Structures are given as C-alpha cells and as structure tokens.
Design an enzyme around this catalytic site. Sequence first.
Site, mmCIF file in Angstrom:
data_model
loop_
_atom_site.group_PDB
_atom_site.id
_atom_site.type_symbol
_atom_site.label_atom_id
_atom_site.label_comp_id
_atom_site.label_asym_id
_atom_site.label_seq_id
_atom_site.Cartn_x
_atom_site.Cartn_y
_atom_site.Cartn_z
ATOM 1 N N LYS C 163 1.010 -1.086 -0.014
ATOM 2 C CA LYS C 163 0.032 -0.091 0.359
ATOM 3 C C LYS C 163 1.249 1.515 -0.172
ATOM 4 C CE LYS C 163 -3.463 -1.913 -0.034
ATOM 5 N NZ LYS C 163 -5.013 -1.476 -0.604
ATOM 6 N N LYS C 263 -12.042 -7.907 -8.435
ATOM 7 C CA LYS C 263 -13.091 -8.539 -7.435
ATOM 8 C C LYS C 263 -13.985 -8.538 -7.683
ATOM 9 C CE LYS C 263 -9.563 -5.942 -5.181
ATOM 10 N NZ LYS C 263 -9.435 -4.564 -4.161
HETATM 11 C C1 LIG Z 1 -5.702 -7.228 0.358
HETATM 12 C C2 LIG Z 1 -6.007 -5.234 0.253
HETATM 13 O O1 LIG Z 1 -5.471 -4.625 -0.113
HETATM 14 N N1 LIG Z 1 -7.680 -5.169 -0.468
HETATM 15 C C3 LIG Z 1 -8.065 -4.099 -0.770
HETATM 16 C C4 LIG Z 1 -7.772 -3.070 -0.255
HETATM 17 C C5 LIG Z 1 -9.039 -3.344 0.534
HETATM 18 C C6 LIG Z 1 -9.633 -4.075 1.669
HETATM 19 C C7 LIG Z 1 -10.731 -4.200 2.769
HETATM 20 C C8 LIG Z 1 -11.868 -3.945 2.252
HETATM 21 C C9 LIG Z 1 -11.928 -2.847 1.011
HETATM 22 C C10 LIG Z 1 -10.424 -2.962 0.623
HETATM 23 C C11 LIG Z 1 -6.995 -3.642 -2.362
HETATM 24 O O2 LIG Z 1 -7.071 -4.435 -3.134
HETATM 25 O O3 LIG Z 1 -7.518 -2.421 -2.761
HETATM 26 MG MG LIG Z 2 -6.732 -1.648 -5.012
#
Ligand SMILES: CC(=O)N[C@@H](Cc1ccccc1)C(=O)O
Ligand SMILES: [Mg+2]
Lengths: 367, 367, 368, 367
Positions: C163, C263
């Site tokens: 992130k 997703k």
């Molecule tokens: C594992 C992770 O980073 N998932 C999301 C972030 C996220 C997690 C949980 C709920 C909502 C968004 C993404 O790829 O943006």
């Molecule tokens: Mg993402």
Amino acid sequence: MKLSGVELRRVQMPLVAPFRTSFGTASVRELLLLRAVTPAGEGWGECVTIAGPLYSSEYNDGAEHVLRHYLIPALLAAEDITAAKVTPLLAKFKGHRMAKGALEMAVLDAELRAHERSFAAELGSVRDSVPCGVSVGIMDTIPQLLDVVGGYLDEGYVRIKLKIEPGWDVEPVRAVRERFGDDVLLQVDANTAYTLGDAPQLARLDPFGLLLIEQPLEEEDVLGHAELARRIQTPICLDESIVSARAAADAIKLGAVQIVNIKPGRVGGYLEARRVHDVCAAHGIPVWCGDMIETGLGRAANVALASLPNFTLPGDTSASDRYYKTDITEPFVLSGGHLPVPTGPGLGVAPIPELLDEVTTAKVWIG
Amino acid sequence: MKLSGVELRRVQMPLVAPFRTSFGTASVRELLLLRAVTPAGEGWGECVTIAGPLYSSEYNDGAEHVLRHYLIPALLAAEDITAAKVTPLLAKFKGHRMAKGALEMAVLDAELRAHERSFAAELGSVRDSVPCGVSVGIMDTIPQLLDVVGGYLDEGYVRIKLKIEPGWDVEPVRAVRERFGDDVLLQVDANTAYTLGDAPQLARLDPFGLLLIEQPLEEEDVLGHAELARRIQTPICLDESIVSARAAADAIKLGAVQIVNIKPGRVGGYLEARRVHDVCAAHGIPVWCGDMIETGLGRAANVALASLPNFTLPGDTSASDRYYKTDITEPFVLSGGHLPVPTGPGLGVAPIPELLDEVTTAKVWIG
Amino acid sequence: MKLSGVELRRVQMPLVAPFRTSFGTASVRELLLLRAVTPAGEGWGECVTIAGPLYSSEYNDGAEHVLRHYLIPALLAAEDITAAKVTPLLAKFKGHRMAKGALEMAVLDAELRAHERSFAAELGSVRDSVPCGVSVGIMDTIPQLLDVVGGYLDEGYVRIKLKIEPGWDVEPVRAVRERFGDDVLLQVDANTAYTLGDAPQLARLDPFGLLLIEQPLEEEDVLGHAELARRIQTPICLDESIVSARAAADAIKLGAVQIVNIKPGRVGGYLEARRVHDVCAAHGIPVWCGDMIETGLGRAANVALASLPNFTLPGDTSASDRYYKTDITEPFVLSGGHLPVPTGPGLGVAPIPELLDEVTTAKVWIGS
Amino acid sequence: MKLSGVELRRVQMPLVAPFRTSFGTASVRELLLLRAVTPAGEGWGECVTIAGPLYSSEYNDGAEHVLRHYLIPALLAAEDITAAKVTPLLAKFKGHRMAKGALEMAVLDAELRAHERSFAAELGSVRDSVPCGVSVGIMDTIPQLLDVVGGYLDEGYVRIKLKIEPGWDVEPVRAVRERFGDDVLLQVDANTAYTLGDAPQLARLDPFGLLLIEQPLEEEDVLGHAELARRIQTPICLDESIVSARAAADAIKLGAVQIVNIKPGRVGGYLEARRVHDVCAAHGIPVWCGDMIETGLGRAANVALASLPNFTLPGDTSASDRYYKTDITEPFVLSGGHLPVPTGPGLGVAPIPELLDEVTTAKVWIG
Ligand SMILES: CC(=O)N[C@@H](Cc1ccccc1)C(=O)O
Ligand SMILES: [Mg+2]
Ligand SMILES: CC(=O)N[C@@H](Cc1ccccc1)C(=O)O
Ligand SMILES: CC(=O)N[C@@H](Cc1ccccc1)C(=O)O
Ligand SMILES: CC(=O)N[C@@H](Cc1ccccc1)C(=O)O
Ligand SMILES: CC(=O)N[C@@H](Cc1ccccc1)C(=O)O
Ligand SMILES: CC(=O)N[C@@H](Cc1ccccc1)C(=O)O
Ligand SMILES: CC(=O)N[C@@H](Cc1ccccc1)C(=O)O
Ligand SMILES: CC(=O)N[C@@H](Cc1ccccc1)C(=O)O
Ligand SMILES: [Mg+2]
Ligand SMILES: [Mg+2]
Ligand SMILES: [Mg+2]
C-alpha cells in the site's frame, strides 16, 4: 451597483534590482491603477500592462486610451452592473484583455466590499496560505546568478524560476544544478524567445530535471508547442498563449501543454482566471499563479486566486520586498516559504494614500 | 461560519398528474429538505433523490442515512466552514453526490444570506429571466399526449421534451410533428432505456428534426454514446452520465456528447454545476438546466443557475403549477414563456412554515 | 426453483494486525453474510462492503438496506430463479454492485450444491492450486515494514504488494529493494490517492522494476490513467475503475490499463467476474485476483476464480491466518506458496455454526 | 471423469429439399457424431464439418482423422478431465476447431448429465424460448424463391435470410421486398463470394433495408470488411472470420463488424462460444445464433446457447422439419415462431437408437 465613475492613475515605482527578461530590462515598474467609485464606496483594480508592447500587444498608453474612450463609458451607460455583467457589456470590444481585467477587478472589489466578502471567498479558496517561488532574471555572469539564487533560497522561497533566452539557457541551468543540487524545484521561462528550429538546444535541458519550460515559442504557435513536446523531455507550460479558458481547452486538446500559468490580467480578469483554473482541473492539468510585478493590490488578489484547489505548483507571487523597498499597501511578507491569504472585505487591502501619492505620476477622473 | 446543526425533513407532495418515465411512474414527490443552522442564521437545501434507486444509485432513505451518520458529522467537526470547503471536508466519502449537493446548497444559502448576496450573483447570472420548456411523460395513448402537449403550448412553454422508451418513440414523435408542425422546439429523453443495438430504431427519429435525444444508453456507456452518434442524425445529450466537470470534459473529448443537461444535485452541488457550465462553454458545448421536480427551493436555485451565459437552450425549469397545486414557497409563475430570476439574499425564497408543516412526514435534528 | 427467503447476518471479526490503506486503518472486519434458502437447499454469500463509503460509495448499512427493501424482494417476487437470472431481475436498480454480487453468490452456491458441482467447475477452473501473494499495509516506520515483509517472504508468499500514498511511496519501495533484492515480485497500490499532477513523483518509481501500480488515480478518471501511462514506466493496473466487463473493455480500448485486478463483489458477482476475465483474455490483458479481507466463504470462491486460465499473475488471496486467528470455515493454509482450490459442492466450504455465532452481532430473516 | 473412450459415427441424413449456398449444393447432410463414455455414463457431441473443405478447411474425413489419432488419445491419456480442461489438453494442436468443439460438446454433455444440469443452465440462459428465423438457399428462378419464402412466413418464422452470390443478389432481394413488403425482417449471406471490387454491386442493396449482410468477403479479409463498411449502408456481419473470442475482439476494434454470427463448432466449442457472446456484449455488438444443419443434438445445444442475453436478433435455429423428415431425436417444433429451450440434464435430448442406426454409415470405438 450603478457605477459613478473611475479614477485612472499612472504610477511609477522603483525596483529593488534590475529585472531582465528575453524582451528587455526594467529598473522601474510603470502601471495603471483604477479606482471605481459607486454610491456604496470605492474598489481598486490594477492593469498589468507595461510601457511598450514587448510582452503582448497591450501597453500602458493603449490601455489608458481604450479604458477611457470605450470600456469605462460602456459601463457608465449601463444601469445595473455586476462583476459578472462586465464581460457581456464589454464583449463587442475585441481583445484588450488586460484593460478589461483591470476594470473587472475594480468593479469586483467594490461589489465584494459592499457584501463584506473577500476575493478568496468569492473565488473558492480552500487554504489560508500559499507556497511561493521566485522568478529570477537574466544576469551578466554565472557567478552573479548563483549569488542571487542562493539569496532567495536562504529567504525560504520553495522554487526557482530562471528567465532564459538564446545564449543563456543550458549554462545557467547546469551551474544552478551543480551549486545547489537536484532537489531544488527548478524551472525556466523563455517569454517566446525560441523557435521550433531550436528544439535540439532546448533538448540539452533534458538531463537537469526541470519542472517545466514556460512559453518557449511565440504566442500564436500552439501547434508548434505540441510539436516541441514530442522532441523534449521537459514539460511544456504556456503563459502568453493562454488568453482564455477556451484557449486553454484548445491547447490541452492539441497536446500543446501539460501545466498552465494563470495570470488574471492576461486572460481578461479574475473571473475568467477562475474558469481557466476549472477547465484545467477538469482535464487533470496542474496550474500555478503568475506574477506581473504587481503592487500589493494585484498581489492580494493573486494570493487569493492561488489558494484555489488546483494550484498545485508554487506560484511566482513573491513577497513585496522581492520587487519593492516600499509597497503602496501593507506589504506581503514571506513566512516559512508562504504568503497568507487576505481576510478582510474585497481585496483585503487598500492603498496607503501617502505612499500612493509619492508614486503617482498622473491622475484623471472619468464620470 | 461554525455549523450548529442541521434539520432533516422528509416531505411528501402530491403531483397535479401522474409523471411517467422509462423507469416508472409517480403520483407524488417524496423528498428530503435540509435546514442548516448557524449563529448567523438559517439556510435551506433540497435533495433530488427519489424513493428507490431507479434513476441513479442514490435514494431518499440512503441519502438520509449517509447525511446523518457521515456527511453532517464531518461538517460539525470542522472549525471554519464555507460552501467551497464542503467539498474537501467530504472528499473522503466516495459518491453520494445528491446528498453532498443538498448539504452544500444549505450551507451556501446560509453563507450568502449572511453577506446579503443572491445565488444568481454568486453563480454569475447575466440575465433577469429565463425561457422555460416542459418535460412531458409517457402516456397510455397518442391522443392523450396530443392533448397535454397542446395544453402546455397554450400556456406559452417554448419547448417540448418527450419521455420515450422502446414501444413509445417514433409514433409519439410523428404524431406531435403531424399535429403541431415543424417549428415547435421538440426533444426526447430515454433515461437509459436503449442499447447500441437499438440504433436502427433511434435512426428512425432522423426525419423529425429533434433538438436532441437525452441519455439514450446507460450511465456508464460513454463510448457507446460516441458510437451511437456516428449512426444517428439526432444530436446526443447526456444527463445521467455527467456526474462532474471531469466527466463532462471526458465525454466531450470522446465525441460522446454535443449538448449537456446540467442538474446540480446529480453533480454534487451548485458550485460543481457552475464548473460543468464553464467546462462546456470552453469547448463550445451548449448547456441547459434540468429539473428533478423540485419544490420552490430547488426551483429558485435552478432558475438562478439557468441565467448563466452558456445556458442557450431552454431548460426543464417549468412553473410550480406544472407539478404542484400548492408549492411550499411563493410559486414560480410562467410569464411570456419565462420565469424570473430571484433577487433577495440567498435562494431569494424560503418555506412558508404552515404549508411546509402540512407536507412534512418526519423531522430530525442533528447537532 | 422459487427463493424462499434470505438470512442477513452482521459479522465482526478481529484482525491479527492493523491494516492501513490510503483511505484508513482497520483492526476489525465488519461484514454482511447472506444465507439464501431454497427448496433445493441453502447457499452462502458474502458482501465485501466495509463500514463507511471510503473505498467505494457502498457500505455495510447501505448494502443491508438495499438488499432488504429492494433486491431480495425482487427475487422473492419472481417465478423461477437461477444465478444467471438474478442480473436481469435486478437490472432496474442502478449500481449497488457489491450488494447484488453478494446475493448472486448465495443463489449460485445454493444452485451448485443442489447439482453437486463446485464453484471451480462452474467458472472453468484449469488448475488445482494457485500461487498467492500478500498485500502489506502502510506502516509507521521503514524498519517495521521490512520486518513484516521479511516475515511474509519467510512464510513462502510469492509476491509482495505495498500500500502506498503521498509521503509513503518511493522510500518504502527503495528500502524493500535494498533489503530483499531485485528478484522479489513487487508491486504497489494507491487506492486512488494520487492525481495526474503527481506523475513526476510516481515516475521516481521507474528504476525499481515494479510489476505494476494499482489504481493511482480516482475511480472515474480512466482517461487520466491513459495519460499517466505515457509518463511512467511502471505498468498501470486498475481496480476501483473496473466495475464491469464493459468498463474493462472501455479502459483497454482507451490505453488506460495493461493489467486488471478482478474483485467479484466490486463487479457485481462471480458471473460478471468471469466475463471480465474473458474480455481481458480476448485483448491479451493479464488479470489477477483481488481480496477484500473476506472470510473463508469469499476466500473459497476467490481461489476458485483465480484458477481460471488468464489469471497469470499471483493474487492477493492470502491464507486465512494472514488476517484472522480463527476463520468461520475450514481455514486456508499456504503450502509451497499456493492455496488449493476447493473440491466439494458449491463453495466447497460452509460456516462452522458455533464459530459463526460467536462472531454474529445481528441477524434477520427476509421472506415473502 | 476419467474418459473410457469415444465412439465415432458417420451419419448420412437426407434433406427435405436441396440446399444451395455460394459454395455448392447438398441433398444430404453427412456428419460425425461422438459418444463419449465415462464410468458415470455417456455424452453426445456433433461435428459440424461437411464432406469437403468448401466452407472452411475442415472436412468430415479430416475431422475423423484428427480426432482419432490426436485429439481423443490426448484426452484418454489425461488423468482428470473436465470440459474446461479440454482446451489446454488440446492446445498444442493447431486449428481443428470443429473437431475440438465436437469433442468438448460430448465431454460437456457427459459432465453435465452427471450433475443433473442442463446446457442452458451451464451457459447462462435467461429465457425459456427463442425466436427463430430460417436460412433460404439460392434457387433457379425468382418465382420458386417467392414460393419457398412465402411458405416459411406462413409457418411463422420471424425472419428470412437469403443466400446470395454474384448473379443472385439484388434481383432476389427486390423481388422478396416487392412481394412481402418492408416489415419482414430480411438479411443476406454470401459465404465469402464477393471481393472489395464488388462494393458498387453490394451498395445496390442499400435501399432494401436489410438487417445485415453476412460474410461478403473471404475469411481472412478482416481489413477489407472494414473498408467495405465505409462504402455500403447495409451492416456487416461476420461468420467464417469469427474463429474465437480474440478474433471477434480484433474485428470489432478494426471496425470490420457490427453484428456477429456465433456458431459453436466454428469457434471450437460451446464454451468458447459463450466467451464470444460475452466479448461482443461488452462492446455493444449484438449476436445471433447460426446453424450448420445439425441433427437434434446440435440443435438442442444451439437453442440453449441462443437463450443467452445478448442474442438479440433471431437465429438460424429452425425447426427440425425445415431440414429433415425424420430427426434422430425427438424433433424441435416451431410454435408461435419460437423453439423451446430444453430442460433435462445435459443436452436435454438423446438419439432414439432405432432412428440413429437407420442413418449410421460407419462406426468405430477408440478406447
Ligand atoms: C488486500 C487489499 O489490499 N485489498 C483492497 C483494500 C481493501 C481491503 C478491505 C476492504 C476494502 C478494500 C485493495 O486491493 O484495494
Ligand atoms: Mg486496490
Ligand atoms: C515597466 C516597463 O514598462 N518597462 C520596460 C520593459 C520591461 C518591462 C518589464 C520587464 C522587463 C522589461 C518598457 O517597456 O520600456
Ligand atoms: C515574474 C515574471 O517573470 N513575470 C512575467 C515577466 C513579466 C514581468 C513584468 C511585466 C510583464 C512580464 C512572467 O511570468 O513572464
Ligand atoms: C415517489 C417516487 O419516488 N416514486 C418512484 C420513483 C419515481 C420518481 C419520478 C418519476 C417516476 C418514478 C419509486 O418507486 O421509487
Ligand atoms: C423533469 C424530468 O424529466 N426530470 C428527469 C427525470 C426525473 C424526474 C423526477 C425525479 C428524477 C428524475 C430528467 O431530466 O431526466
Ligand atoms: C471495519 C471497517 O470497515 N473499518 C474502517 C474502514 C477500513 C476497512 C478496511 C481497511 C481499512 C479501513 C471504517 O470504515 O472506519
Ligand atoms: C453432403 C456435403 O457435405 N455436400 C457438399 C457441401 C455442402 C454442404 C452444405 C450445403 C451445401 C454444400 C460437399 O462437401 O461437397
Ligand atoms: C443454415 C446456414 O445457412 N448455415 C451456414 C451454411 C452452411 C450450412 C451447412 C453446413 C455448412 C455451412 C451459414 O450460416 O453460413
Ligand atoms: Mg512566459
Ligand atoms: Mg434524462
Ligand atoms: Mg455465412
């Protein structure tokens, strides 16, 4: 708001140091100020023309003339009037954007003073201060440039802009990069001094990591800038070419520009400047606030304008003392590299009458 | 302005006649009103959501919920607030544009009332009145349509807009053209009811000289609208797709739109609506003002918005009595096919408390 | 079959460690589960909404509301139902993709259990296990990041996703590259935190050989991503923007994307996800499977989905214990950097009722 | 499933009437059927090849050969098998799509019968019946054509497709239009018989309002179709050229096609056909189901396929008796212009063994 009349003043103010640009050198700023008078009270505007037509086709005597015999009379003949209505009332007159903008500024300042509202609030300010860079002129020697630059970095200016022209581009840039390093925010400005045939020379700036090159080619050569952008790594910024929101949209659609310099006068006022900001934002084009060595009146309006959300690069709105020992308003003072956004009604500043008189060269009432 | 709190009201108002659209039929308007309270005084806003998510994903209970638990608390927690600052304060919340827009309207109304300034003046009005068209629903029979249309032409509406859908497009248009002639300004609106596969059917509208077809395809299918434009002569207008100024710029760059319908709530407020106007003007794209069957609060703000310079086609801002026997405000009354732009501070209108109480179904204070 | 009704549950599960993203931090996962009841039997679905509208406009109370008063009643009012027919039956309702996708998942799970058929078989699985990466949050210090990353490489995760956000991009990447070297598969994810004006800062990531940068700009700014791609060497991947197969086709045609994160909830279900996969494959665009910190129900469905042929980059479908001490299903356990694809009917897993009750905060039945 | 073996049958079935196309004439249908045997039970597949390579490079003896010595052995050698895994298990063999598709069909029918699931359910059916058109061959005289067409309109077919070729295009279309009027859904199919040099002749079809022209140019000439589309008003549909989902995406990106004919065998199976459907839907391209004069086995699978959401134009899946007095399955019977979607497990039909034996010319077991 019925407009009662306008006072036109010629003003001459000495500069702390000569300012050299690709089009010439100045030791003094000669400008027009406007005092719009209403039954309610007074508003101030500033024209950003210079003495001769060397930056654009407009100049001080031309602006004074067109204001006096066409623009001001067209407003006095109208009955209502608001800052917004200035544009349609003056639409039949082609061009003369700096002059129209000065007039619109004075009307807007009077209108906003009467509603006890700041320029910042009217324009849509989202911050209380703005980061400030400085514009640095052409010099006679490299070591004199390094001194001046080092001085402004010491005062806490957050970005350096160098004026450039043929014979004064790669060497000054290399020197500044050698002395002060690669983390200084550094850009250049040609004021139209190159042609598309000088692309290989401008491409020699590629390795110095400049934020931008401002208006390398002539005002009318928008397609040429798009051609130039295919040949150099430095992003193109336009100034002289951006005369309106429509012009910005056109330039953007043609790939002629990546970053825009906004100067209210050049575009025919603070209200058109806001529209330029909005058009650029909608296309993802960052803008920054330009400076025409204004007095504190224009400086107050510009600092307000620069606090809008898409102003994401530092502007040329330097502190009053970069240009003037004595400003005609309470002066703007750098603090942590920032200038504060004015808070009172209208511009949030007014001329100190004693200081204004010292520098007034001429004065006429139009009623 | 420190915001003290907000009053959320549910309101239900009967319609003079059923209003049928490609997504459903309504005999009643259910809506949310907001009363923002400051130390200075009050401001009113109106949400344009409907009962369920049939026009867009937002709906009344959803708007009430997101306002109450996210949007309003975020404004109450801030120190200093301005209409302009509402956007950055709420930026972390994705979507919910109609809800944000309603809240921004109330804050703006309170701010402007305190400076004794109209919505028209803040937005940049250049006229005192605006020409008005009318939106006409889907009917059970062609003769019932011709009646209704004939009635509205008699009242002096300057343009007719017909709701359309599969099974109700070419016939109603031909009939209106056979009965009232080729000089009536006539357009259609599909509210997303077609696909690109229906192009040959929509091309059957080519000979009737329509001003536009509004949102023939789904909200997300901007490229499909550009494809559709290569197949039909009727100009494409977008409504549902235009959620922001950036969205309008994107649609225009892709050749997906020739005319834009502006609805403040749909784009997240009157301030964004102004930016949509400015972006469209800069590209030469005419705009016109939409209607969401608002009460006199929203109608007042819309009429102000529709007085901006690039609104060059008549809007859907019809007179109060097109939709309601009794408005909660002083009603808007057609006069020479025009509605007059309000003049007092803020919206220039306020709810008549006895009329508002008659139609209020629920009320809560958030503080 | 006729749908008899649906049970909506609110569930709260603690996370093994705080998870920070450009939009906020979470110590807990709050979610909606659905139990669809038919004559044929039960099926489970999971909504991927979070508590407030910080990632997209949808959120837990909003999803619960729209399911209860619009989506579920529209399915109960229909004569015959299949997973495929859920889309047209709900088409009149605009948006609410995560909610629709959750409801579709439950209906599909019930349909497939009755035919004794796996999600994997229905979706078109071609492999029995899938390689798994891990998504690593923003941390307070570089050395804490290096520790966590080093830990996940030790467990055998085949790829690291960081992130990022303004103030936390070039430094964490450089540090990870200095400590662990240039052969680690490394990517970043901004969750919409930048603008096109930040292109020179994102171009500073050019020398670190990242696989991709995921969703650098806002959801609606597809044309901006195409512009950004002309200014940086790191390939662009979209997540938030890819709300349907049509959206993916549009992004691809505009040059706005080179790799797509799928997703299922974000696109309105596993069946639309399959169509996204197929559209991307037809244009030569690799895809990979995203994760929304699901329970074992969603994780099972995602591992199945990830076993389709054009998933040619490792996914975020990490092992259960990366997020949870105790999953409500049989946990997923990493093995040689892979997770195995489930084999039974439907999802191939079901909640263990006692574990599910410990974690249930609310429950309601919706019937005709 | 471990696959135990496959039975290959040659079958010959007489046609009710000669069928003429730009590539030849047939009074009989010669085809390959496959019976896949598992421990679980059986499944059936049908190859859509014809006797020689006149429609594509594949033909009956070639398909039998490649199935027997490459494709079937590669599946027998595998440990686990699913319909989805067929494609990767056979990927090393280039082409032979009709053959691969026939084998995939059988495997899929066996898999789905074992889960008690229909083709319709697997593919994503959203309706229980589908509207049906008819494909009408080239005839010796115009009056004989008008008879046959009139007959099929009388039976309640909802659309007519005419085979065409040089010397038989404008006249038959004009005649059908003069006799039956402009509301009949009418299209043509050239099976590759023209060149881009024949554009002026194909442009003579502009005034007759055809839905489409199918595959006017050769299989490989995708760019030529895009050129042809700039020169004629009739929308282009591709058949022979669409060998895969990737091919459809490529054709669509190049502007070579507006409507796509899907034939499962041509694209290497029902599972690739579903992908072609999904790719086309995502670009806004309508699809419709083709026919290769299949027996009831293929017909059942096609009717299921045709019930997917983007099949928005009537297909060529005509009733069994348009081609055959006696089908080898329970026959498909037109009813209100529709055919009903099968409901049982797998195909929902199976060969009636006595009828199948009558028409079997050869049989071999591969184990
Ligand atoms: C594992 C992770 O980073 N998932 C999301 C972030 C996220 C997690 C949980 C709920 C909502 C968004 C993404 O790829 O943006
Ligand atoms: Mg993402
Ligand atoms: C203030 C003024 O008008 N000076 C010069 C030119 C000039 C202005 C500003 C900067 C450099 C040169 C002139 O035109 O004579
Ligand atoms: C600070 C500066 O360089 N301003 C002008 C130059 C200039 C100064 C004074 C009058 C006109 C132009 C520019 O941005 O080009
Ligand atoms: C009162 C109301 O919002 N009725 C419709 C919506 C609607 C509004 C306007 C026109 C038609 C339908 C619903 O069922 O949600
Ligand atoms: C007046 C009208 O037709 N308004 C919407 C339809 C609509 C009416 C009421 C509430 C929501 C939408 C449109 O411009 O598309
Ligand atoms: C449980 C939850 O949804 N928490 C955070 C959001 C969040 C979810 C996932 C990751 C980080 C933050 C909130 O909305 O306050
Ligand atoms: C029986 C057969 O396959 N006949 C022709 C082809 C054919 C099939 C269908 C229609 C016309 C011709 C041949 O290959 O010679
Ligand atoms: C029913 C029909 O016209 N089928 C093929 C022609 C054909 C028939 C039989 C066997 C092979 C090809 C087409 O659509 O081109
Ligand atoms: Mg310049
Ligand atoms: Mg509309
Ligand atoms: Mg053909």
